[PDB]
Amino acid sequence: SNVVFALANTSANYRPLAEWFSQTGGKEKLEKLWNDASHHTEKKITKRSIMYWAHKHAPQQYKEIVEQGYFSILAEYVYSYNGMLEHYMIAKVIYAMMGNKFVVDVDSNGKYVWFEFVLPGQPMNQGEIWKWRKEVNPDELHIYISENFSRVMDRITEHIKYHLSQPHESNILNYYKKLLKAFERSKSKIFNDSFKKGVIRQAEFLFRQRSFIQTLDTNPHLLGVGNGVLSIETIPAKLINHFHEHPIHQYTHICYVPFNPENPWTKLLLNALQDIIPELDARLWIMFYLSTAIFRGLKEALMLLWLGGGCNGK
């Protein structure tokens, strides 16, 4: 179900389906055929999930194949238009290269605000660990265009030099020399500020989501926590500490859930909350109502009054 909702965005998804479940037995999941051709569903996991389905059991080959794809896209862009590398081809390679980390929306005033997925090897504030943070200028992408993409730039240069150092004819060598010199004049443009601003403003149309702000914190069962993302769909707390498709932005920097141990702090908190007011048959209503504050709505409309006493536990 996960992979079928992942690649259901493709209109011709049945050919990857027949490729994948052709492997012990299975037989198209006993001829399920997308559960006998089901209709559209909620926004499940996307294409960006599959490269995180990989990279945890096979990182080297995944890195090599994405690097080869990056080199292929840049090589076809360089060969199609001899040396001129304008804003859109750089934006296309950048979208292919960081497409699972950045999105952009047109939320309120017609302005294109960015959202960056954070990683543990990044400077966050306190608790933005695995959730999208709002950005006015893509500073990480601005650094990434000049630092990481320049490695692909020298890779393309090295391939051009290798093709130049070959026993070809004179006209092919002249064409490759012209391509190399035009490419070398255009290579330094990826460090220019105006060019990088144009690349960002062109990738704003390519990193689009069209529904990102509309569903940011719509669901109530996903909660922003200091250690990552907390989920309360099932009885155990999931504590999502990996890449995920859930597009939550707001968070609590001080929650920091350590699951639920029975250490000294939890014991003293429990001894503080109870053993002060006597209850019959383990009555627990008031601190059960202290819960359900981690939900959005669609619940009971109760209204509790704690008032009473001067220096009590209010």
Binding site: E158, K161, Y162, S165
Partner: protein, 281 residues
């Protein structure tokens, strides 16, 4: 530079498939600039040597080492303390006599094959004296020796009175302790290569020694005249077996990897004056 670009393409596109793990004995070639280790088959070793030779003739920065392993050519590493900061003369007669004495110890090891055989000696010299410190390598790349035999030959050479005399008359003040006793085991710089803080040793003179088991008292030593005609990285290599001048004679048998970016703080982690640390540790 074209020939450096060519070597870069050979290494990354083609020889990358021979990359060895750290501490893998299979390793025969070490590129200390890229920190890469390789096990090159003879065909790919030669292709490497053609590229390194072109890079050498254009004075390119190389730091290639070959691993001697258990059976390969002999290398002698001399670290000289001199009377003065003048390059010692080291003319053919002195170097010729050195070859003869080196050979007497090889012969005395009893491992030479019977019959008539040519073996080549090459003397590469430190380009200048620095504070009276000087050096030469003696390469006998074609004479394939067991590591244990090399160690034995080196032991004997350290105590050779005639060698000590020759070195003394050249102005050497450490003639008893100038031969590195680990000459047998250390990885050996390819011709044209050096530590990143040093300049590469230059080939001054090579000699052809013919020995004949039937005529043991006839040991002709002559200067090699057309050295420039050969691929010198190739010929001087202790592990090469496919040289043109040098034909083999078979005798009886750091992990921080900064990658030019993160080591800068190392450059300012030395001049702290933080020897004594009561609060500062």
């Amino acid at each position: 530079l074209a020939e450096v670009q060519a070597l870069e393409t050979l290494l990354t596109r083609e020889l990358s498939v021979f990359l060895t793990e750290p501490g893998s004995k299979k390793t025969n070639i070490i590129n200390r600039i890229t920190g890469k280790t390789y096990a090159l088959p003879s065909t790919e070793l030669l292709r490497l040597y053609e590229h390194l030779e072109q890079c050498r003739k254009q004075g390119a920065l190389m730091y290639f080492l070959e691993r001697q392993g258990t059976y390969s050519g002999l290398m002698l590493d001399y670290d000289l303390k001199l009377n003065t900061n003048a390059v010692p003369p080291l003319e053919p007669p002195a170097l010729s006599r050195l070859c003869h004495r080196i050979f007497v110890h090889i012969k005395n090891s009893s491992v030479l094959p019977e019959g008539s055989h040519k073996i080549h000696f090459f003397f590469t010299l430190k380009p200048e004296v620095v504070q009276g410190k000087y050096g030469f390598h003696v390469l006998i790349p074609g004479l394939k020796l067991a590591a244990s035999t090399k160690k034995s030959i080196i032991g004997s050479l350290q105590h050779d009175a005639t060698v000590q005399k020759i070195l003394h008359e050249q102005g050497v003040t450490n003639p008893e302790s100038c031969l590195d006793p680990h000459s047998a085991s250390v990885p050996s710089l390819l011709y044209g290569s050096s530590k990143l803080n040093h300049k590469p040793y230059q080939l001054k003179t090579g000699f052809e020694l013919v020995f004949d088991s039937s005529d043991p008292d006839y040991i002709p030593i002559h200067q090699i005249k057309n050295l420039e005609s050969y691929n010198l990285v190739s010929e001087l290599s202790l592990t090469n077996e496919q040289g043109s001048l040098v034909r083999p004679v078979y005798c009886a048998a750091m992990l921080h990897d900064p990658e030019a970016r993160y080591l800068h703080k190392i450059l300012n982690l030395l001049p702290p004056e933080y020897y004594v640390e009561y609060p500062l540790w």
